[PDB]
Amino acid sequence: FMKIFSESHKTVFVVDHCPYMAESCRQHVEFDMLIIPLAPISKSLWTCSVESSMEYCRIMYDIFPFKKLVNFIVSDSGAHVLNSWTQEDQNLQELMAALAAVGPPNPRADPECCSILHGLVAAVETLCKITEYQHEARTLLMNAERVGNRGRIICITNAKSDSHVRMLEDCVQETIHEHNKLAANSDHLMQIQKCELVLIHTYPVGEDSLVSDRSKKELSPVLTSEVHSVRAGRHLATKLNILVQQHFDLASTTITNIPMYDVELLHHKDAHVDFLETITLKWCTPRTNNIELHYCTGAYRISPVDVNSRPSSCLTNFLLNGRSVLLEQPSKVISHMLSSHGGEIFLHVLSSSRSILEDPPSISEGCGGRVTDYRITDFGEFMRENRLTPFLDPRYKIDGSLEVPLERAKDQLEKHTRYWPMIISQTTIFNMQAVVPLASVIVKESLTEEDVLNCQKTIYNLVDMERKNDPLPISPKRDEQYRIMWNELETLVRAHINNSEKHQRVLECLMACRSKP
Amino acid sequence: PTVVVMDVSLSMTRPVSIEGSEEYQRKHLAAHGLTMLFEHMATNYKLEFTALVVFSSLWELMVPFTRDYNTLQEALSNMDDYDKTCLESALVGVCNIVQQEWGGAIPCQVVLVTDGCLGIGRGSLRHSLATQNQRSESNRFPLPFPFPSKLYIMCMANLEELQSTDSLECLERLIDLNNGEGQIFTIDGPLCLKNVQSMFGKLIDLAYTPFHAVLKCGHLTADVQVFPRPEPFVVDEEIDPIPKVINTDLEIVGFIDIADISSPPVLSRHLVLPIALNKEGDEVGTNSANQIAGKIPNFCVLLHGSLKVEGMVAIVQLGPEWHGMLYSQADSKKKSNLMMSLFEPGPEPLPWLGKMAQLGPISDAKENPYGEDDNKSPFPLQPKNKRSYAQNVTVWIKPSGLQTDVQKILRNARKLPEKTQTFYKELNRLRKAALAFGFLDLLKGVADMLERECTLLPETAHPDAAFQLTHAAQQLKLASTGTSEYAAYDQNITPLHTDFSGS
């Protein structure tokens, strides 16, 4: 098997575009609210199936931005693949434009050779084409490509009878069998080790279904089939909403007590593994200054079931603005947190039980706990000056084997700590404001011309201080103070003379100006 | 945490040696072994929580989870004697007291001390192992433990005695029911204090040896202890099968503000505490020793103090393509010390940070990305494509979803030419969605509603409103036909360039 390459890696939709799909679902839509009100209108079976399948892909793409690919196929007199397996083609906007280009089914059109079988064959053929992720796994193993290739075919059509449905299953079974032989003898295709066929029969409301439900049946060691009979409109969309939760192991979470109804979110089931069908979490009133760093055992992307409803819009827009939401299970228990990360909303799993790290040992009773003069302020500035920042394009400062940004950050920490006394009483030059212009730049890789001038001006000022006999923070004699001060400054400069030739000249300036060694 | 399950049944009162080689009973060598364990914990594994459970016909939580290993030691003194054994019921209690305190994600080690004599009958282990399949959820077997567990069984009976009565086979069956997570400890020789101490000494080396490491930030170093000892991590058994252990040298590679790290998902949290070592790597002879170490400046104190004051975390390299963070206790009214969390192994554990290898120093940047007043931040990184909730999407499945779009179009239709731009953006928004879904009848219905709004325009209306409403209503009907006009997805409805403004 392959873990990421299960059935949900490849999903192929097959919707029929035949004239009979233009039939009205006979479920009235009230668009005009309050004069004589306009007559309600109804959607076609094709519109109902395109709505439900696109909503299926909306929830999947939010929760799985990568590695869960879709191929959308429409079937009439032929098969039309609207997008490929590439991650770039996993785009709802581009799918809507393609669906608009094929247009609605023409009721007064030739219904000959118009069949769902065209897209069903195309579904089998694209399942044998390699995805980008599968192609990369093949190149790696060269365990020599034990790469799994599984898929799922979701087919929405209007079938004649159960006999007609069984014929569709047998055609898919025979097509998988024959094309696997062709895929085996091809250098750029893969056989279908497992395939799940989901046949969804939809029909207008008020009629009696000509197709009956049938549970999963093993037609082949590769193919498992399963049929559904569901009314078009709200019922058909509810079926695909349940199917998207089963196909991708999704759980439901309902957030209550939202001050501004209730909001339902979909996410991977692992977000509720720690807790123990819907999980009700109460909105906790956000304190103006709560804990900034929460211990999190898991963060899972979400997707709102009713993305455009006002309660769900108020919740999502609240998170997108920058504020987080704590969630409570009905003192009290805060178990989850909703937080947006650059526009992407994750459901954070928090810890509710007692911490095994509670009541830690006292800092004061451990090693170095009785030292009172740690340079906490200075080292805090050290941390601010050594903060990390993302680099997108590969960069350099010479030429050769490329330079890694994190290695340079690690290297800067090495240079910055070649001389860094941890306590106040162990240093003199790092307690003097006059040394800052030199100490802050002498640790650099190379010195600019203004850096050299400031290093020399620093050394020149220290000579003025020694002549005026200014007191020094050394933590004893005035002549002994500057001797120790010069030795410490010499130690710092010598720690970096190999950086550049300008560093060497700074030392030459120091040795000539300091009190005679 | 640790749960000690001690057998106090009648068989534990049998002599250790019928030859009179030693005076102890089975329960006395059991107490001596657990004394050795508790004494080791009290000095080399102080922070471990340990509970004591005794069991016979009934089981009782004698000491709840505690770090006070004196009270655990005192519980082994003058222990009462009882009767039969009921091992399964006590293991049910182990599941209860563990989840009731720590949940189901914290690794716990269960130390079962018994002589293997579990009898025959109702509460016997031989019967419980035989009736493993039945009863289903109402009376399910406690093994495997719902939490990550190790089942160490300390046998107060030699190998020859256990084999002579099939008792050893039942104890081995318990570990197999725990997916092999655990180990049987037996003595293939004379039962005595010397061999029992050797037995518990092997348990100590296996399950309670503290994890030593070196915390480094450039040339600033400190010998540290990582508690609890990190569990070896296996990613995917098919792809990457080697268990990952964190690097002994914990190299800090940079710092990130707490607000930028947000609240990242981590594998586990661990306290990082300095330890006093000497020439041979010995930990200072395991009050004069701590007083000397207390006056030696330590990098952990400086690091933790600065991390808390600055509200920052320190990124650590746990290994190749494995990173974590060091931070201070963020609840400000609890006790605080330095601790470390491990990220999911890989190059991009956190999307809002990007690839960890591409995080570099601000010195290599052209401008300071955090701002001169430290008022900006290069974080969070944003995903290349927006999500459905951070972007305009059309959903007309529920009737209230369609009525919301037409009401936003109607509201802006009654506010022309002020809201001309948003009126035509919401109009083309519904036009494109109707062409994609094949819901052309909606275009006819909306166009009829725009014609009604134009006729119902009050006399106190701007003159341009009537022109744009009929223009939008007519161009929407021409799109509902399907014949190539505005039925194309790309051809938007543009407003009429009326000259009502000042020429």
Residue numbers in the entry:
A (entry chain A): 0 to 33, 41 to 148, 150 to 267, 279 to 294, 312 to 365, 370 to 514, 523 to 564
B (entry chain B): 2 to 287, 297 to 513
Task: Recite the paper's sentences.
For several indispensable short non-coding RNA transcripts in metazoans, this initial 3′-end processing step is carried out by the Integrator complex (INT). Collectively, the data suggest that the INTS10–INTS13–INTS14 subcomplex forms a nucleic acid (NA)-binding module of INT that helps to bring the cleavage module into proximity of transcripts.
The structure reveals that both proteins share a surprisingly homologous domain organization and form an interlinked, strongly entwined, pseudosymmetric heterodimer. The interface of the INTS13–INTS14 complex is extensive (11,180 Å2) and involves all domains of both proteins. Formation of such an interlinked dimer is difficult to rationalize from already mature, folded proteins, and suggests that in cells INTS13/INTS14 folding and dimerization are coupled. In addition, ~140 residues from the mainly unstructured INTS13 C-terminus are missing from the structure (residues 565–706).
